[PDB]
RNA sequence: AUUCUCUCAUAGGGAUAACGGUGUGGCCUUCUACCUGUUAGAAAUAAUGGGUCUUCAGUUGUAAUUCGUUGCAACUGACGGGGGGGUGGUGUCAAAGCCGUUUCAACCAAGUGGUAACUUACUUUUACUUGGGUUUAUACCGUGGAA
RNA sequence: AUUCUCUCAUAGGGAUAACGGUGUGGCCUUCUACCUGUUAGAAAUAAUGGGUCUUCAGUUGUAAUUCGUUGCAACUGACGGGGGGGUGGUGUCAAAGCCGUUUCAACCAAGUGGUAACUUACUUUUACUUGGGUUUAUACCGUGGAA
RNA sequence: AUUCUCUCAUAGGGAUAACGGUGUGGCCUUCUACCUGUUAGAAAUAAUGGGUCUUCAGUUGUAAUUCGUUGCAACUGACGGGGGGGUGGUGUCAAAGCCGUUUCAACCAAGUGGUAACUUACUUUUACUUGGGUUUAUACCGUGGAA
């Protein structure tokens, strides 16, 4: 098919996607505002709707305008490409200064350039997919865990690349292009050179074409490491190498060092940890040793795999915020006007908080459905929650500790709510749910039923963990994900 | 010969041995009581004779009854064995709870079962003795010491098995039985299965048959280690491996780890020390290092072999107790009735104490006999003392320190005795041996002679050490032991 | 040619050299005394001339007497050599007790014996020069630096021989003589045996013949190390071995240890440092690591080569002493009689101090000559100063720090001089050079000119460093040295 | 006599008084961008007396290629430590930190329990002094001779 | 106009006013153990309203084998953190320790020099919401038109 | 009865009263340098009673070789811990340190929060007692018999 048809199709698809998103955004904002008005009574702020700032700078950024004229641009681009005069327009870049990632500048490109880059990247990847080394990182996690279990003592080397994209040398890339027997047409080379453009060093960040170049640069390193006989995995901006012999790990370190010099890239000293030995807890080591290793939010050890501390902190933060927002925040305003005061042993806010916590943790599944699936009465279940992102966890003690934390936090929050209500002049200590001790919370809430459905049940990590383990055993990681 | 004759002979020998022992016990107790009556005067306690408690539980335990009827049991056992209905009776087990060894349960079996086990074990060992890897541990000590001296830097790995006997898997043993081309008759297999009996896991402790099974289980490990090329020695519940290359020691560690998993045995983390480098004192090491290694009460280092600290503590305890018992303990009783008070420059208790110390250290040999043997006037000497258990010691400084300790302790004990005697109302400061200073003790005691024999000489470790070294050089360790 | 002619020539050359030296000594002492008389006025001490004490003990030590009768000695020596009755006379030995080097005894020999030893050593070295392994240590420094830069991680082992000369075993040397296929005539062997003479162990120190023996003893060690594949360098009483594999370094350590036992030499434990890993700063190591290594006054690291701390301390000491001697010391005497007081904005002592510092640092070269050579107006320069001894330094920061130190010390010394002059009763604060602040010292001194030559310029290390680097790049180390 | 001769030659006899070196000057020749005074005298040139510049990395411009980085501008960026006290900004919710002004120290000392001295000196490489050559101009240094 | 047409086509002309989505309900069909009320009406069955169970490891018993661990009972063992104060046992020669009762804290906090706030929020993977399909029932959200 | 016999034989019948060990002495023989008392009686020898020596490393001397270190002198160097207090030298600019005299402690204790007891004892190898042989000299130890 002609170039124009393909360009038109890609531009149309991109515009339709962006429009769709925007529409969902404003509709959700309306629903949330409606709920907030009831929650905060007459102190609720008014609704505000915003449009992205960068849309104003150029008409091309705005999706609707591009949708209006999606034919002229395609023809002009095709003609400019045939004439070999095409050049991508300047991107919009905004820095994100932070302690981690430094400047962490991010760039966004106009819709036509992004569409062209995506099309070319897809074609190149399709033709050259076979000549490449082995969301699929989970299989690597399984392999490393199995190897770690097989022998207690393993040698590990961890390298953290710093400013990998920024320092790539164009001459090195030019050398790679001629060698390795890859298939690249003249037009593709022209487009790649056009994208590099003025930049003296480095490759553009935030573009689809860049990923292919990154894979291309590391082909020789992968071949050399495979020839050596060590095992390795590379994901994002990190690499891990493990072996059972000191000599091989030393040779791998030498190869990595020599490669960095050739390609003008530097390894951050602070982030890099160096060679170490991973051994079971309670056994001495003759060299520097560690008992746990982190990979993509997973903590791996000889005995078991557990969730990383930071993820646990985020989960605790979210649950705490939900409880605070629904129970304590509304009562600290100057005037309690428009709000509903709990009475006759009924509290709506407690129900709303419990439902939101259930949605965050499971996705809305009831305990009965999980039990039925486990027993075998039903054949299917859907996983749509925070737990889905960690399908391979096998540690039981941590989940129990988390469940205890949830129950205690709920009890303390309810007590503080009761104190504030008493301070405002209403005494509701006798009425439920303020009359229940910590030990009795689970059973009393479990028994209570509203409208024939048990909506007061406290969620438990262990039950979902059991369901996940059974699903994994009887199926595959790809099926679950 | 028929089975009955062999069974009869073994049972008779066991009964005669036990009887003999008992008779020696009671006779010795009588002699000791007679001496105690003189030592403690009229405060001496009366003699008490006891019989082992477990004898009462069953008639078979008692030796005399079994001696009375040693024919019927043999015939019945032979018939039951031929019918394949034989089963060993339950053993008597008494726990020994302690910090070291934990429960440390010990079991004793009746005389017929023990005789049967000994007979079968002897036959099996005789037939299968050749297919086994190399009181003979002393030769191993010589070899390791020579290797340690040859090169200053050596790599060592030490593993302490925990509950080795308890956790042996029967399935693994069954697998070993079929393989390895050993010669085992049907009756032997039947007896081994009978001994295992109800036990789900583990092998009986305290029986002769168990040792053969233990050697059988470790055959593959020994073959693999020999194939690797490292050198090792296994005695009791400990193993040592040494080599001059890091790679081999790492491979040996891997082999040991893999074997433990296969045979369901665990290595105690606390007792195990891990890989280390043994180097001469005053030289730095790049990894964890040690300057001394302990083996069966021996401390081995690059420079020399010396006695372990615990053994020295036991020797000090025994010598101190003997001096206290003969010099201080009799004078702290309420009434000094029936005792003899030192007078006219003569003290019997000092003579008795010195003679007991000499018997404990040498075995009763005089200094003259040792000197004659060293010079060559005589051709033979007998070694029967505490020193005999440590025939390879070559450290001279430690022996000198011990001799100084002995002289000082003797002087202090005599001074305390003099003070107590003065407190009771007798002043004997002028009379010997209370008039001698520490420096003059050895010479004055040496010169004094009673009945034409020098009985007041103070024993010296160095002289016996010289005699032992000369005997070892002119003979062999087997001859000395 | 006959033996007599050669002996005569060597003796004559030695005597003429020694005489020459003596004459230069006394003439220099006269000039220095003349300058001192002006510097210290009427407090100057009187001149004293001395002759070496050992000259008195024997007439042979004195050069003039040997020069008077250089013919008889040659004939007598030749006849005694032919008769095989020659024996060297006893040397004069004086101990130099110190913490470093211990007794450090040094021996001096009479002129004829030294001449004979030099002649024989030269002939033996000439014939056997080819059979030897690779002021030439600088090339080794270049090679080690290049290797260190090539790979960041390197393994190093350093051994310090102790009393190497003292403990050499004669039997070992005798064994070496027969083997290795060296060419040694009977007379040479006779002379070597004569030199060893009464000494039971060791070889004489301070004689030319000894060096050849030292090279001869280590031939086997060098061959073995080369066969192993490691790289090494031996200079004076130290050796360094470096490699990129742990196994090879361990084998080299074993070879060195085995050799020492065979040749009865010991390695000092304190001086020896053991195996270590040299890595770039800021990168972790799994074993003992260091970031800098010292060799013959040079400090070598991955980034650059810099001067050792001790040499810097000596340079600081010399510059400080020169400033103190010319500026402060003359004014602390009891009476300022015969001295010249600074007046009319002129100070001779400052000029003398600056000229002496320039002579010590450069050798007298002006800034203009260096600038002309750098630009290319002139083609040649001569290097004759302290800097010449360190021709390979490439560190710039250290030189800048040294220059700042020099300027500050000059300013402080001038201030103290002004205070002392005021204390004596003369106020010269307004007059130069006491009116200049630290910042303005360099420019004001630079501009000032006397007799058409700029003699007040402050020397700078960086300019000479640049000249040295340019000379090295455009020539060779041998040419510069 | 350190100069020259004789034999028994690792030591002994003789005969002559000079024999070895250092500083300064001279001469020979040896690698050197300019701009200006006053002399001389033809600008052939000299003679003297004053002053400025030289490096590295760019940014480009250029050109040139000689197929690369060359030669040029012109641009702009470098190019003389550290320590102890006082007092100002600005840094935060406190703070670190970063800037600037004024004082104290001959050096080791960015430290010792405490801090002064020393170059014919101290000790582990630690060591050398200014293109050469030749100067019976000139003044002096060992040891002799004379006395 | 985000709808539709025209050319010089990354920009320009026109013509019509509608054009994209969200919640709830409906319908279609799609994987589900029982025991009981009241309805209806024949127990063919419906209609609604209430309540219980589901996992893992054993111990065995059993049987069965299908040559092994199967299917069953029945048994008994699991299955919702941590921190600071008070007061009881029991632990020793002192003691650790182990047990139990009562109080304090919205979370990071098992900590900071000190401890409050926040979701259209914060940032390193940090990201998603409830079998589908179709509903001019019904109520609303951008941007237009009318005004 | 632990001694001896019988059968149903991991248990049952009988008949006799002795049956196993320890200390001391005796005898048999077994590897031992001298010098002296008193006995006896011929120095063949005995009998008893008193006292000394034995090792390693040298230095050499020697000799010898047996081609090396041998055998000898003779020389000189070794050969019985540690801790807490007081008081002397000498060590420095202070000091460490090295020497010497006097006191305290039954051992672990060169240490514990604190320090006493114990051998038919305690526990991780921890375990053995004095060339053998034979002694119806002599005195005693289990269990029996008699009573």
């Amino acid at each position: 098919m002609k170039l124009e048809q393909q360009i038109q199709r890609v531009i149309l698809e991109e515009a339709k996607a962006l429009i769709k998103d925007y529409h969902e955004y404003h509709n959700r904002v309306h629903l949330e505002s409606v709920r907030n008005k009831k929650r905060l009574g007459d102190s609720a702020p008014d609704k505000k709707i915003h449009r992205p700032n960068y849309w104003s700078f150029d008409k091309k950024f705005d999706p609707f305008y591009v949708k209006s004229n999606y034919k002229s641009i395609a023809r002009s681009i095709a003609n400019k490409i045939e004439n070999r005069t095409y050049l991508p327009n300047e991107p919009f870049t905004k820095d994100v200064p932070k302690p981690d990632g430094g400047i962490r500048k991010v760039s966004i490109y106009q819709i036509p350039d992004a569409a062209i880059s995506k099309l070319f990247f897809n074609r190149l990847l399709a033709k050259n997919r076979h000549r490449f080394s082995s969301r699929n990182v989970h299989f690597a996690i399984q392999d490393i865990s199995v190897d770690l279990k097989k022998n207690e003592r393993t040698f590990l080397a961890e390298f953290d690349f710093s400013d990998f994209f920024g320092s790539i040398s164009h001459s090195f890339l030019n050398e790679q292009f001629n060698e390795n027997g890859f298939y690249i047409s003249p037009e593709e080379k022209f487009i790649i050179r056009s994208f590099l453009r003025e930049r003296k060093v480095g490759i553009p960040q935030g573009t689809s074409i860049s990923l292919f170049l990154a894979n291309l640069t590391c082909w020789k390193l992968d071949q050399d490491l495979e020839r050596e006989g060590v095992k390795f995995s590379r994901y994002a901006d990190d690499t891990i190498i493990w072996s059972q012999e000191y000599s091989k790990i030393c040779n791998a370190f030498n190869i990595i060092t020599n490669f960095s010099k050739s390609a003008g890239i530097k390894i951050n000293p602070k982030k890099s940890e160096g060679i170490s030995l991973l051994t079971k807890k309670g056994l001495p080591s003759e060299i520097t040793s560690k008992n746990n290793l982190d990979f993509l939010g997973y903590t791996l050890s000889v005995e078991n795999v557990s969730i990383k501390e930071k993820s646990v902190k985020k989960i605790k933060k979210q649950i705490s915020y939900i409880l605070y927002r629904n129970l304590i925040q509304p009562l600290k305003k100057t005037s309690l006007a428009g709000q509903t005061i709990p009475a006759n042993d009924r509290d709506k806010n407690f129900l709303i908080a419990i439902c939101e916590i259930r949605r965050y943790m499971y996705g809305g599944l009831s305990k009965s459905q999980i039990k039925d699936y486990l027993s075998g009465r039903s054949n299917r279940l859907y996983f749509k929650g925070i737990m889905s992102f960690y399908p391979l966890v096998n540690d039981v003690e941590q989940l129990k500790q988390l469940d205890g934390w949830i129950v205690s936090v709920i009890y303390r929050a309810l007590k503080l709510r009761c104190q504030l209500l008493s301070k405002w002049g209403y005494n509701r200590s006798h009425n439920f749910p303020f009359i229940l001790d910590r030990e009795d919370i689970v059973d009393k809430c479990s028994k209570k039923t509203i409208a024939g459905r048990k909506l007061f049940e406290i969620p438990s990590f262990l039950l979902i963990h059991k369901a996940l383990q059974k699903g994994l055993q009887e199926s595959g990681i790809e099926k679950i994900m």
Side-chain angles (χ1 to χ4, degrees), chain A residues 3 6-8 10-12 14-31 34-41 44-45 47 49-58 60-74 76-78 84 86-89 91-92 97 99 101-102 107 109-112 114-128 130-132 137-140 142 144 146-148 153-159 161 164-166 168 170-173 176-177 181-184 186 188 190-192 195-196 201-204 206-219 221-223 225 228-232 234-236 238-257 259-260 262-265 267 269 274-275 277-278 282 284 286-288 290 292-293 295-302 304-305 307-308 310-319 321-333 336-343 347 349-377 379 381-396 398-422 424-426 428-436 438 441-442 445 448-459 461-468 470-472 476:
Chain A
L3 193 50
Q6 316 198 316
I7 294 174
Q8 278 177 342
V10 191
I11 303 193
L12 204 73
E14 286 248 323
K16 291 151 128 292
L18 271 60
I19 282 152
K20 183 178 179 180
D21 286 18
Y22 190 78
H23 276 345
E24 299 184 336
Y25 151 77
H26 66 75
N27 272 344
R28 164 206 324 141
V29 169
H30 176 80
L31 253 56
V34 156
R35 275 208 270 279
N36 207 17
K37 176 112 199 97
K38 193 175 306 307
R39 178 187 67 105
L40 273 194
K47 155 167 98 191
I49 305 276
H50 331 291
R51 272 163 173 243
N53 66 285
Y54 63 88
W55 284 17
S56 71
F57 314 150
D58 196 291
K60 311 276 203 31
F61 283 124
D62 184 1
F64 301 98
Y65 166 64
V66 181
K67 179 59 163 60
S68 89
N69 215 359
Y70 88 99
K71 286 181 154 127
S72 302
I73 316 196
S76 176
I77 288 307
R84 292 295 185 286
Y86 165 80
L87 203 173
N89 289 337
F92 158 67
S107 79
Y109 281 78
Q110 293 177 335
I111 314 184
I116 291 305
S117 64
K118 204 156 111 62
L119 156 75
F120 276 58
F121 160 89
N122 296 331
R123 308 190 293 166
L124 286 155
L125 191 133
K127 326 177 295 178
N128 304 280
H130 67 264
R131 323 257 329 279
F132 273 130
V137 196
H138 271 272
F139 312 131
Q142 321 208 38
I144 167 175
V146 170
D147 265 352
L148 253 61
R153 322 163 78 242
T154 299
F155 288 94
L156 299 146
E158 293 146 289
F159 303 104
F161 292 150
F164 163 60
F165 265 33
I168 302 188
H170 299 112
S171 42
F172 176 85
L173 268 168
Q176 322 293 119
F177 275 132
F182 283 120
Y183 325 118
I184 293 146
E188 273 103 306
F190 165 51
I191 295 287
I192 298 160
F195 272 112
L196 295 174
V201 279
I203 59 175
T207 312
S208 315
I209 218 77
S210 308
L211 275 66
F212 173 79
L213 301 197
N215 294 286
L216 193 91
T217 69
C218 303
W219 182 77
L221 173 69
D222 295 334
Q223 172 142 329
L225 293 158
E228 177 52 279
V230 297
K231 321 196 72 179
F232 61 99
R234 185 157 27 90
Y235 159 90
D238 289 345
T239 189
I240 313 318
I241 324 163
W242 65 94
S243 179
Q244 311 233 320
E245 314 183 27
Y246 192 46
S247 62
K248 323 198 162 266
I249 216 69
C250 285
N251 303 359
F253 204 122
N254 298 355
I255 297 165
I256 293 265
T257 282
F259 156 87
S260 64
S262 64
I265 294 169
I267 67 141
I275 317 195
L277 186 75
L278 197 159
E286 64 268 10
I287 66 157
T288 316
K290 48 196 299 187
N292 41 22
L293 188 147
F295 192 177
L296 65 80
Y298 271 128
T299 280
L300 320 179
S301 64
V302 164
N304 41 22
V305 63
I307 312 194
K308 195 173 48 199
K310 270 174 78 274
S311 279
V312 167
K313 293 277 273 312
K314 310 213 58 144
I315 299 168
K316 297 198 164 197
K317 167 80 158 116
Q318 187 75 26
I319 301 187
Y321 178 78
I322 299 165
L323 294 155
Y324 175 68
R325 169 194 197 87
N326 297 285
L327 299 182
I328 302 146
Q329 216 185 66
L331 289 157
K332 303 212 299 202
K333 310 251 169 296
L336 308 194
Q339 319 198 20
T340 288
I341 289 331
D347 201 7
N349 295 67
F350 189 42
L351 196 38
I352 280 147
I354 294 283
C355 296
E356 302 207 0
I357 302 193
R358 200 180 293 127
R359 207 187 80 113
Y360 178 68
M361 294 177 58
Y362 297 166
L365 284 158
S366 160
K367 300 224 176 166
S368 97
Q369 325 196 35
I370 300 160
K371 296 269 235 327
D372 292 357
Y373 166 89
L374 290 187
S375 96
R377 194 175 306 179
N379 53 57
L381 218 54
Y382 75 94
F383 306 85
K384 280 214 62 51
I386 197 49
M387 210 53 193
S388 84
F389 298 93
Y390 309 84
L392 324 175
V393 185
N394 74 29
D395 184 303
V396 161
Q398 178 181 59
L399 294 195
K400 290 151 92 293
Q401 296 160 61
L402 261 162
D403 288 19
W405 177 85
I406 307 188
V407 188
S408 324
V409 167
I410 293 187
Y411 171 66
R412 300 215 270 281
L414 273 166
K415 190 156 173 249
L416 178 46
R417 178 162 165 93
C418 196
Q419 313 186 351
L420 288 156
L421 277 149
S422 81
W424 285 96
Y426 316 83
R428 305 271 184 282
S429 55
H430 46 287
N431 320 87
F432 151 103
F434 305 117
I435 183 137
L436 314 151
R438 190 230 193 236
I441 287 174
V442 183
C445 283
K448 166 163 319 281
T449 89
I450 186 167
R453 293 236 300 281
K454 319 194 163 318
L455 301 188
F456 277 106
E457 27 186 25
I458 320 294
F461 274 120
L462 293 154
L463 191 75
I464 191 66
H465 170 42
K466 293 179 179 179
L468 276 173
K470 152 154 172 179
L472 222 69

